[PDB]
């Protein structure tokens, strides 16, 4: 009846037709059919992305690939709890009004000049999107932007609004690239290839600092704003109070343990996922310090994402067990033999960068990182590189409305068109493809 319902039923027909008409070994065809089914469900978002995550195990058990608990244990990978600690910290420095005070304390340094305050906004947004979230910080910042731009006109010099808002949302989606926490695809990659915090920052932070100024430049040049002006913000200013400095101490200590986590771990006894134990310790420090209450951490966190991590991991483990990934790798051996590596990562980056515009970031990553990480384990390639690339590119959703929520938050206001976003995001996605390809080809060496 409904559209998505027809999508699902066509998906089931496709899966049955594959399962029956694909002449292979049973496990190859089973994994192929599950992959097609899950993919069509994770791109079209017929069923909530997390419902499909849940459905992955149910089809990994009902066909004998796994024992129930061996599948359900995918939903407890230490990266899930690292992201839960990230959500706890976000809730602490939101409920306790830390992010807002940070923003106001930055803007005030730009005494009254918008020309520097907008770049302050971009820096702040990409400095908070690391930890807090991509949607939440964009929603928090849009009011600040409008307060910055209540002076200027909305129809005459509208390019200024487009610049400010797009830069904000772009900066959120980018700053999400700078920490495991910050965007789910980071964690999907890390869990699929076993990465730490500071063993992922090495790929994230340089990329974010090399891609954010790029995007700001391309906005400033495709759009010719009138950023000269004065700055009148109307809200009761904020100030440091006990409970915020405590939260800052806890947050800084947690980040410190996260960064220097190998030297500390070795000096403690060598535990496997010490960043996750740092995250849990952050939860406990916060709760024992009373800055946050678990009700906030449960109202804020997105447990759908935390079930998605497990669903994608189970799909990875399915493509592993069934040897589907190896079947493909053997099927694509000649093409990838002729194609080097530069072309491989170029194709991957192009595909995901122009995909996540139409699909979601988290779902697209959960779908592809398993596929390509396994197919790369088969080929010998390092799954770390491809997983990181697909987690960094899936964030690049700069082209149109809901591809990331931030774009849609901005394009709720109505001061930006669609065509301008399409053009800007096209140029930006090309440049980001170039940048990802270059910094990857570097990290290879």
């Amino acid at each position, epitope marked *: 009846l409904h559209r998505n319902s027809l999508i699902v039923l066509a998906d089931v027909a496709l899966f049955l037709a594959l399962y029956h008409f694909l002449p292979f070994e049973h*496990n190859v065809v089973l994994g192929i059919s599950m992959l097609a089914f899950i993919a069509v469900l994770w791109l079209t978002e017929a069923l909530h992305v997390t419902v499909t995550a849940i459905l992955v195990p149910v089809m990994a058990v009902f066909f004998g690939i796994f024992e129930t608990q061996a599948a359900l244990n995918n939903f407890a990978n230490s990266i899930i709890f690292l992201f839960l600690g990230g959500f706890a910290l976000a809730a602490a420095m939101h409920h306790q009004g830390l992010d807002k005070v940070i923003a106001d304390k930055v803007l005030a340094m730009a005494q009254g000049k918008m020309s520097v305050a907008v770049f302050m906004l971009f820096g702040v947004t990409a400095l908070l999107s690391m930890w807090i979230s991509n949607t939440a910080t964009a929603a928090m910042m849009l009011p600040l932007v409008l307060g910055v731009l209540s002076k200027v006109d909305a129809d005459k010099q509208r390019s200024t609004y487009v610049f400010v808002l797009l830069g904000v949302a772009y900066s959120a989606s980018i700053g999400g690239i700078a920490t495991l926490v910050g965007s789910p695809p980071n964690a999907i990659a890390a869990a699929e290839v076993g990465l730490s915090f500071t063993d992922w920052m090495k790929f994230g932070l340089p990329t974010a600092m090399m891609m954010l100024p790029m995007a700001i430049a391309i906005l400033y040049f495709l759009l010719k704003p009138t950023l000269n002006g004065m700055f009148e913000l109307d809200r009761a200013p904020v100030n440091w109070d006990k409970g915020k400095v405590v939260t800052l101490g806890i947050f800084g200590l947690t980040v410190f343990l996260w960064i220097f986590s190998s030297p500390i771990n070795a000096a403690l006894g060598g535990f496997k996922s010490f960043d996750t134990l740092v995250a849990l310790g952050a939860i406990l420090m916060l709760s024992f310090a009373r800055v946050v209450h678990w009700k906030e951490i449960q109202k804020t966190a997105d447990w759908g994402v935390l079930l998605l991590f497990g669903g994608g991991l189970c799909l990875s483990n399915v493509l592993k067990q069934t040897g589907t990934s*190896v079947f493909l790798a053997n099927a694509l051996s000649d093409m990838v*033999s002729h194609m*080097g590596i530069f072309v491989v990562i170029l194709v991957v980056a192009t595909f995901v960068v122009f995909l996540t515009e139409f699909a979601s970031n988290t779902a697209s990553a959960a779908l592809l990182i398993p596929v390509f990480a396994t197919v790369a384990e088969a*080929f*010998g390639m*390092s799954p770390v590189l491809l997983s990181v690339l697909i987690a960094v590119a899936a964030s690049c959703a700069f082209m149109l409305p809901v591809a990331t929520p931030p774009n849609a938050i901005v394009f709720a206001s109505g001061h930006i068109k669609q065509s301008e976003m399409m053009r800007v995001g096209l140029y930006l996605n090309i440049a980001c493809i170039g940048l990802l390809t270059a910094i990857a080809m570097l990290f290879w*060496q």
Partner: antibody
Amino acid sequence: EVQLVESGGGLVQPGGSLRLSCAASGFTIYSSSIHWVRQAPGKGLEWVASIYSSSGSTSYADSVKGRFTISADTSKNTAYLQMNSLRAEDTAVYYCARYNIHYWRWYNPAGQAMDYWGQGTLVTVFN
Amino acid sequence: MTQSPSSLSASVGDRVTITCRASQSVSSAVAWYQQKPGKAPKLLIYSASSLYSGVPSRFSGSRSGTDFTLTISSLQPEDFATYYCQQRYGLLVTFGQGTKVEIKR
């Protein structure tokens, strides 16, 4: 704990046929690739064939395509290399190694690259 | 894939290096093997440089593009053997042409 025992290697005539078996213990063939490696008579190592049974995906070397055929039945553990149309330039000491690929994220005695080979079955094509 | 040098004349205590060029710049699956005459090869390094459990620390590896490389810091009298590089690409393997280190005089 883990070991691979190679059998079926012996005398043969050209245009003939033989069949080596590589019985495994300590792991499951289902979760690893099996690799058949003829060294040479008094020369260096040469790779011949490979199989991943979970998929049935086999890869022969460019020198043995319509002459060899690898196979594997799980449920005990095995990896058979049926050699056919054996030529004079095929006498050697065939080893059978395991290569784990995927790291499996939970647990396995799996190794990661040809850690555990065997001892060698010598086949001597003969006139 | 192609492995150089063919033969190495190295005295004990010396540091020796071996190079292996791949010609398929996709697979970082290069592993290094130590074979004594007639015996089964013994693994040292698996991906390109990361060491194996049961091997001395003097056996190090490097990638440097496609010019994979093996390094033995202190050449001990038991490290005189034949060294091979294998590159897995998918399911198919291919070893190196063979490197032989001999105690010089």
